[PDB]
mmCIF file of C-alpha atoms and ligand atoms in Angstrom:
data_model
loop_
_atom_site.group_PDB
_atom_site.id
_atom_site.type_symbol
_atom_site.label_atom_id
_atom_site.label_comp_id
_atom_site.label_asym_id
_atom_site.label_seq_id
_atom_site.Cartn_x
_atom_site.Cartn_y
_atom_site.Cartn_z
ATOM 1 C CA UNK A 1 -31.295 2.367 3.251
ATOM 2 C CA UNK A 2 -30.309 5.732 4.950
ATOM 3 C CA UNK A 3 -26.946 6.661 6.400
ATOM 4 C CA UNK A 4 -26.516 5.122 9.888
ATOM 5 C CA UNK A 5 -25.828 6.758 13.182
ATOM 6 C CA UNK A 6 -22.399 5.384 14.017
ATOM 7 C CA UNK A 7 -19.781 5.623 16.720
ATOM 8 C CA UNK A 8 -16.435 6.170 14.900
ATOM 9 C CA UNK A 9 -13.179 4.607 15.979
ATOM 10 C CA UNK A 10 -10.712 7.111 17.352
ATOM 11 C CA UNK A 11 -7.330 7.571 15.651
ATOM 12 C CA UNK A 12 -5.145 4.534 16.610
ATOM 13 C CA UNK A 13 -8.102 2.656 18.107
ATOM 14 C CA UNK A 14 -8.534 -0.993 17.067
ATOM 15 C CA UNK A 15 -11.451 -3.335 17.427
ATOM 16 C CA UNK A 16 -11.656 -5.807 19.027
ATOM 17 C CA UNK A 17 -9.432 -4.181 21.660
ATOM 18 C CA UNK A 18 -6.714 -6.870 21.541
ATOM 19 C CA UNK A 19 -3.614 -7.368 19.355
ATOM 20 C CA UNK A 20 -4.285 -8.303 15.740
ATOM 21 C CA UNK A 21 -2.628 -11.745 15.802
ATOM 22 C CA UNK A 22 -4.393 -12.988 18.992
ATOM 23 C CA UNK A 23 -7.172 -15.614 18.726
ATOM 24 C CA UNK A 24 -9.965 -13.132 19.412
ATOM 25 C CA UNK A 25 -8.919 -10.979 16.482
ATOM 26 C CA UNK A 26 -7.388 -12.212 13.176
ATOM 27 C CA UNK A 27 -5.185 -14.953 14.595
ATOM 28 C CA UNK A 28 -1.613 -15.863 13.826
ATOM 29 C CA UNK A 29 0.477 -15.108 10.767
ATOM 30 C CA UNK A 30 0.890 -18.283 8.683
ATOM 31 C CA UNK A 31 3.557 -17.232 6.170
ATOM 32 C CA UNK A 32 4.083 -14.964 3.201
ATOM 33 C CA UNK A 33 2.359 -15.978 -0.031
ATOM 34 C CA UNK A 34 4.677 -15.249 -2.997
ATOM 35 C CA UNK A 35 3.412 -14.956 -6.591
ATOM 36 C CA UNK A 36 5.426 -18.011 -7.586
ATOM 37 C CA UNK A 37 3.954 -20.225 -4.819
ATOM 38 C CA UNK A 38 1.212 -22.824 -4.733
ATOM 39 C CA UNK A 39 -0.686 -20.903 -2.080
ATOM 40 C CA UNK A 40 -0.818 -17.919 -4.475
ATOM 41 C CA UNK A 41 -3.389 -19.864 -6.422
ATOM 42 C CA UNK A 42 -5.905 -19.682 -3.572
ATOM 43 C CA UNK A 43 -6.090 -15.891 -3.765
ATOM 44 C CA UNK A 44 -8.683 -14.626 -6.264
ATOM 45 C CA UNK A 45 -9.237 -11.130 -7.639
ATOM 46 C CA UNK A 46 -11.994 -8.896 -6.306
ATOM 47 C CA UNK A 47 -13.611 -7.245 -9.349
ATOM 48 C CA UNK A 48 -16.462 -5.482 -7.516
ATOM 49 C CA UNK A 49 -17.335 -2.403 -9.612
ATOM 50 C CA UNK A 50 -18.177 -0.474 -6.444
ATOM 51 C CA UNK A 51 -14.653 -0.559 -5.066
ATOM 52 C CA UNK A 52 -11.696 1.538 -6.284
ATOM 53 C CA UNK A 53 -8.402 -0.287 -6.337
ATOM 54 C CA UNK A 54 -5.410 2.093 -6.275
ATOM 55 C CA UNK A 55 -3.171 -0.373 -8.169
ATOM 56 C CA UNK A 56 -0.102 1.878 -8.194
ATOM 57 C CA UNK A 57 1.717 -1.398 -8.933
ATOM 58 C CA UNK A 58 -0.119 -1.800 -12.267
ATOM 59 C CA UNK A 59 -0.290 -5.533 -11.472
ATOM 60 C CA UNK A 60 -3.795 -5.884 -9.965
ATOM 61 C CA UNK A 61 -2.205 -7.179 -6.700
ATOM 62 C CA UNK A 62 -4.487 -4.908 -4.629
ATOM 63 C CA UNK A 63 -7.481 -6.963 -5.847
ATOM 64 C CA UNK A 64 -6.103 -10.301 -4.560
ATOM 65 C CA UNK A 65 -7.396 -11.445 -1.183
ATOM 66 C CA UNK A 66 -8.933 -14.462 0.523
ATOM 67 C CA UNK A 67 -12.637 -15.188 0.127
ATOM 68 C CA UNK A 68 -13.210 -14.225 3.773
ATOM 69 C CA UNK A 69 -11.533 -10.857 3.117
ATOM 70 C CA UNK A 70 -13.475 -10.414 -0.149
ATOM 71 C CA UNK A 71 -16.889 -11.079 1.511
ATOM 72 C CA UNK A 72 -16.221 -8.553 4.280
ATOM 73 C CA UNK A 73 -14.820 -5.980 1.812
ATOM 74 C CA UNK A 74 -17.889 -6.391 -0.422
ATOM 75 C CA UNK A 75 -20.246 -5.862 2.520
ATOM 76 C CA UNK A 76 -18.259 -2.804 3.385
ATOM 77 C CA UNK A 77 -18.523 -1.450 -0.202
ATOM 78 C CA UNK A 78 -22.310 -1.440 0.196
ATOM 79 C CA UNK A 79 -22.343 0.293 3.541
ATOM 80 C CA UNK A 80 -19.887 3.020 2.439
ATOM 81 C CA UNK A 81 -22.074 3.945 -0.527
ATOM 82 C CA UNK A 82 -25.104 4.076 1.798
ATOM 83 C CA UNK A 83 -23.323 6.180 4.417
ATOM 84 C CA UNK A 84 -22.030 8.773 1.906
ATOM 85 C CA UNK A 85 -23.928 8.588 -1.401
ATOM 86 C CA UNK A 86 -21.530 9.598 -4.201
ATOM 87 C CA UNK A 87 -18.480 8.210 -2.332
ATOM 88 C CA UNK A 88 -17.051 4.652 -2.664
ATOM 89 C CA UNK A 89 -14.700 2.317 -0.787
ATOM 90 C CA UNK A 90 -11.081 2.573 -1.978
ATOM 91 C CA UNK A 91 -8.350 -0.025 -1.367
ATOM 92 C CA UNK A 92 -4.697 1.215 -1.376
ATOM 93 C CA UNK A 93 -3.178 -2.174 -0.494
ATOM 94 C CA UNK A 94 -4.583 -5.711 -0.649
ATOM 95 C CA UNK A 95 -2.294 -8.691 -0.978
ATOM 96 C CA UNK A 96 1.250 -7.354 -1.327
ATOM 97 C CA UNK A 97 4.501 -8.316 -3.007
ATOM 98 C CA UNK A 98 6.270 -4.916 -2.908
ATOM 99 C CA UNK A 99 7.551 -5.702 0.547
ATOM 100 C CA UNK A 100 7.064 -2.437 2.534
ATOM 101 C CA UNK A 101 4.768 -4.008 5.209
ATOM 102 C CA UNK A 102 6.310 -5.291 8.458
ATOM 103 C CA UNK A 103 7.442 -8.928 8.184
ATOM 104 C CA UNK A 104 4.448 -11.127 9.263
ATOM 105 C CA UNK A 105 1.957 -8.512 8.025
ATOM 106 C CA UNK A 106 -1.360 -10.113 7.060
ATOM 107 C CA UNK A 107 -1.066 -8.215 3.758
ATOM 108 C CA UNK A 108 1.448 -10.852 2.641
ATOM 109 C CA UNK A 109 -1.283 -13.513 2.989
ATOM 110 C CA UNK A 110 -4.117 -11.616 1.242
ATOM 111 C CA UNK A 111 -5.798 -11.357 4.692
ATOM 112 C CA UNK A 112 -5.625 -7.534 4.983
ATOM 113 C CA UNK A 113 -6.562 -4.332 3.171
ATOM 114 C CA UNK A 114 -5.656 -0.723 3.760
ATOM 115 C CA UNK A 115 -8.658 1.456 2.811
ATOM 116 C CA UNK A 116 -9.886 5.010 2.467
ATOM 117 C CA UNK A 117 -13.033 6.610 1.107
ATOM 118 C CA UNK A 118 -12.742 7.495 -2.585
ATOM 119 C CA UNK A 119 -12.679 11.278 -1.791
ATOM 120 C CA UNK A 120 -9.757 10.803 0.609
ATOM 121 C CA UNK A 121 -11.736 12.804 3.180
ATOM 122 C CA UNK A 122 -9.894 12.045 6.427
ATOM 123 C CA UNK A 123 -12.898 13.242 8.487
ATOM 124 C CA UNK A 124 -14.662 10.081 7.355
ATOM 125 C CA UNK A 125 -12.001 7.511 8.248
ATOM 126 C CA UNK A 126 -13.054 6.936 11.881
ATOM 127 C CA UNK A 127 -16.589 6.236 10.653
ATOM 128 C CA UNK A 128 -15.233 4.115 7.769
ATOM 129 C CA UNK A 129 -13.388 2.108 10.435
ATOM 130 C CA UNK A 130 -16.665 1.549 12.358
ATOM 131 C CA UNK A 131 -18.403 0.382 9.142
ATOM 132 C CA UNK A 132 -15.484 -2.063 8.588
ATOM 133 C CA UNK A 133 -16.156 -3.502 12.101
ATOM 134 C CA UNK A 134 -19.861 -3.758 11.243
ATOM 135 C CA UNK A 135 -19.024 -5.440 7.916
ATOM 136 C CA UNK A 136 -17.426 -8.253 9.941
ATOM 137 C CA UNK A 137 -13.652 -7.733 9.577
ATOM 138 C CA UNK A 138 -11.941 -9.711 12.398
ATOM 139 C CA UNK A 139 -9.669 -6.804 13.201
ATOM 140 C CA UNK A 140 -9.912 -3.110 12.311
ATOM 141 C CA UNK A 141 -7.315 -0.521 13.244
ATOM 142 C CA UNK A 142 -7.309 3.211 12.506
ATOM 143 C CA UNK A 143 -3.658 2.734 11.796
ATOM 144 C CA UNK A 144 -2.588 5.963 10.147
ATOM 145 C CA UNK A 145 -3.968 9.379 9.320
ATOM 146 C CA UNK A 146 -3.614 8.059 5.766
ATOM 147 C CA UNK A 147 -5.722 4.860 5.920
ATOM 148 C CA UNK A 148 -7.597 2.294 8.013
ATOM 149 C CA UNK A 149 -6.198 -1.307 8.145
ATOM 150 C CA UNK A 150 -8.628 -4.199 8.207
ATOM 151 C CA UNK A 151 -7.847 -7.914 8.343
ATOM 152 C CA UNK A 152 -9.422 -11.319 8.641
ATOM 153 C CA UNK A 153 -8.837 -14.715 10.153
ATOM 154 C CA UNK A 154 -7.327 -17.474 8.092
ATOM 155 C CA UNK A 155 -9.951 -19.371 6.073
ATOM 156 C CA UNK B 1 19.771 -1.207 -25.647
ATOM 157 C CA UNK B 2 17.649 0.001 -22.733
ATOM 158 C CA UNK B 3 18.027 -1.877 -19.445
ATOM 159 C CA UNK B 4 14.891 -4.055 -18.997
ATOM 160 C CA UNK B 5 14.831 -5.434 -15.442
ATOM 161 C CA UNK B 6 14.587 -2.622 -12.883
ATOM 162 C CA UNK B 7 16.145 -2.148 -9.426
ATOM 163 C CA UNK B 8 14.395 -3.590 -6.397
ATOM 164 C CA UNK B 9 13.716 -1.269 -3.525
ATOM 165 C CA UNK B 10 14.682 -2.957 -0.282
ATOM 166 C CA UNK B 11 13.859 -0.272 2.286
ATOM 167 C CA UNK B 12 12.107 3.025 2.637
ATOM 168 C CA UNK B 13 12.085 4.951 5.901
ATOM 169 C CA UNK B 14 11.320 8.488 7.026
ATOM 170 C CA UNK B 15 14.434 10.435 8.026
ATOM 171 C CA UNK B 16 12.331 13.299 9.339
ATOM 172 C CA UNK B 17 9.153 15.182 8.603
ATOM 173 C CA UNK B 18 10.160 16.188 5.076
ATOM 174 C CA UNK B 19 12.593 13.470 4.034
ATOM 175 C CA UNK B 20 12.492 9.804 3.163
ATOM 176 C CA UNK B 21 15.457 7.575 2.476
ATOM 177 C CA UNK B 22 15.234 4.540 0.190
ATOM 178 C CA UNK B 23 17.834 1.857 -0.562
ATOM 179 C CA UNK B 24 17.839 -0.493 -3.517
ATOM 180 C CA UNK B 25 19.571 -3.446 -5.151
ATOM 181 C CA UNK B 26 20.348 -3.471 -8.809
ATOM 182 C CA UNK B 27 22.372 -6.303 -10.389
ATOM 183 C CA UNK B 28 23.719 -5.257 -13.835
ATOM 184 C CA UNK B 29 23.921 -8.917 -14.793
ATOM 185 C CA UNK B 30 20.113 -8.922 -14.817
ATOM 186 C CA UNK B 31 20.560 -6.858 -17.964
ATOM 187 C CA UNK B 32 23.402 -8.874 -19.459
ATOM 188 C CA UNK B 33 25.692 -6.298 -17.943
ATOM 189 C CA UNK B 34 24.407 -3.385 -20.112
ATOM 190 C CA UNK B 35 25.721 -0.047 -18.715
ATOM 191 C CA UNK B 36 23.489 2.464 -16.919
ATOM 192 C CA UNK B 37 23.672 6.264 -16.713
ATOM 193 C CA UNK B 38 21.816 6.337 -13.394
ATOM 194 C CA UNK B 39 18.495 5.679 -11.630
ATOM 195 C CA UNK B 40 15.234 7.728 -11.695
ATOM 196 C CA UNK B 41 13.373 7.782 -8.367
ATOM 197 C CA UNK B 42 9.635 8.703 -8.609
ATOM 198 C CA UNK B 43 7.471 9.717 -5.691
ATOM 199 C CA UNK B 44 3.839 10.918 -5.410
ATOM 200 C CA UNK B 45 1.528 11.369 -2.364
ATOM 201 C CA UNK B 46 -0.396 8.093 -1.830
ATOM 202 C CA UNK B 47 -3.631 10.124 -2.016
ATOM 203 C CA UNK B 48 -3.004 10.464 -5.762
ATOM 204 C CA UNK B 49 -3.755 7.641 -8.166
ATOM 205 C CA UNK B 50 -2.737 9.735 -11.194
ATOM 206 C CA UNK B 51 0.555 8.538 -12.678
ATOM 207 C CA UNK B 52 1.116 12.132 -13.856
ATOM 208 C CA UNK B 53 1.567 13.264 -10.307
ATOM 209 C CA UNK B 54 4.927 11.455 -9.786
ATOM 210 C CA UNK B 55 7.910 13.778 -9.330
ATOM 211 C CA UNK B 56 11.357 12.305 -10.450
ATOM 212 C CA UNK B 57 14.878 12.699 -8.946
ATOM 213 C CA UNK B 58 17.962 11.388 -10.803
ATOM 214 C CA UNK B 59 20.926 9.816 -9.016
ATOM 215 C CA UNK B 60 24.097 8.415 -10.592
ATOM 216 C CA UNK B 61 24.665 4.789 -11.443
ATOM 217 C CA UNK B 62 26.976 3.984 -8.585
ATOM 218 C CA UNK B 63 24.531 5.032 -5.865
ATOM 219 C CA UNK B 64 22.350 2.523 -4.032
ATOM 220 C CA UNK B 65 20.546 4.860 -1.648
ATOM 221 C CA UNK B 66 18.949 8.292 -1.870
ATOM 222 C CA UNK B 67 17.126 10.808 0.368
ATOM 223 C CA UNK B 68 14.107 12.388 -1.165
ATOM 224 C CA UNK B 69 13.655 15.815 0.421
ATOM 225 C CA UNK B 70 11.218 18.685 0.492
ATOM 226 C CA UNK B 71 8.262 16.399 1.278
ATOM 227 C CA UNK B 72 5.225 17.227 3.459
ATOM 228 C CA UNK B 73 5.095 16.244 7.133
ATOM 229 C CA UNK B 74 2.945 13.249 8.237
ATOM 230 C CA UNK B 75 2.301 12.370 4.552
ATOM 231 C CA UNK B 76 2.351 8.976 2.805
ATOM 232 C CA UNK B 77 4.133 8.725 -0.530
ATOM 233 C CA UNK B 78 4.210 6.036 -3.276
ATOM 234 C CA UNK B 79 7.856 5.473 -4.338
ATOM 235 C CA UNK B 80 9.192 3.480 -7.331
ATOM 236 C CA UNK B 81 12.342 3.688 -9.480
ATOM 237 C CA UNK B 82 13.974 2.719 -12.718
ATOM 238 C CA UNK B 83 17.563 2.515 -14.051
ATOM 239 C CA UNK B 84 18.246 4.152 -17.446
ATOM 240 C CA UNK B 85 20.742 4.846 -20.271
ATOM 241 C CA UNK B 86 20.694 6.434 -23.665
ATOM 242 C CA UNK B 87 18.697 3.452 -24.864
ATOM 243 C CA UNK B 88 15.849 4.303 -22.444
ATOM 244 C CA UNK B 89 14.443 3.257 -19.047
ATOM 245 C CA UNK B 90 14.089 -0.100 -17.269
ATOM 246 C CA UNK B 91 10.778 -1.505 -16.021
ATOM 247 C CA UNK B 92 9.711 0.137 -12.761
ATOM 248 C CA UNK B 93 10.725 -1.499 -9.517
ATOM 249 C CA UNK B 94 8.316 -2.640 -6.769
ATOM 250 C CA UNK B 95 6.283 0.276 -5.458
ATOM 251 C CA UNK B 96 6.878 1.182 -1.801
ATOM 252 C CA UNK B 97 4.556 3.215 0.406
ATOM 253 C CA UNK B 98 6.159 5.278 3.125
ATOM 254 C CA UNK B 99 5.112 8.187 5.370
ATOM 255 C CA UNK B 100 7.263 11.076 6.517
ATOM 256 C CA UNK B 101 7.312 11.772 10.213
ATOM 257 C CA UNK B 102 4.820 14.101 11.952
ATOM 258 C CA UNK B 103 6.013 17.644 12.763
ATOM 259 C CA UNK B 104 8.173 17.832 15.891
HETATM 260 CA CA1 LIG C 1 -1.344 -0.942 -3.878
HETATM 261 CA CA1 LIG C 2 1.609 -3.316 -2.727
HETATM 262 ZN ZN1 LIG C 3 -2.597 -2.644 6.393
#
């Protein structure tokens, strides 16, 4: 259906309005998942054709995420296309093994994504953040001028 | 006779609004001890997903840190590196993402 009337998040706003790792948001960090580990096997790739994965790693790591993260991300892909026809959801970081995120980042568990719109139009990111809240991410933070960070609770 | 395994980038941090410093480990043994002429450091704004947009600095083989300069303020970059010799280039390292500082 038609684009929605939305209230965007402000730069550096997060929703819910509590720290990411608290119970009301995404909950605690449970430990890095390394490629070589048994827990790595519970991550599966998101191959949704309506999402762009940056994949600067050329490894497909950005596609790996928990099912809870995948379901929210997929809902979000639909609402982005409906909000701005001709524009898609883009993921810059999904699960990570490059190691630039703060220690205890939910990226290391496949429980977070950093996203933009596919046109990199920063005027849309506050609205993109509101759609991520509406898509059911357990925490959404307009973290940087460069991207919005979204995460989920542990399965 | 190219090196195969690349360096691993351990840290990237903004020095100021136009400059980012990275540090890396490279253990020559990982390539049987093969000798390297230096490292290539590649960096591209994170808004680009075109591999053609990486710019390249060269540093010498004894260096394990480098400051990339003449970057844009408050801008995220993708940063990866290789070691090389006459035989060719290693695999790329891990790819870091790091923003310069906002303008003072
Ligand atoms: Ca990535
Ligand atoms: Ca990564
Ligand atoms: Zn993030």
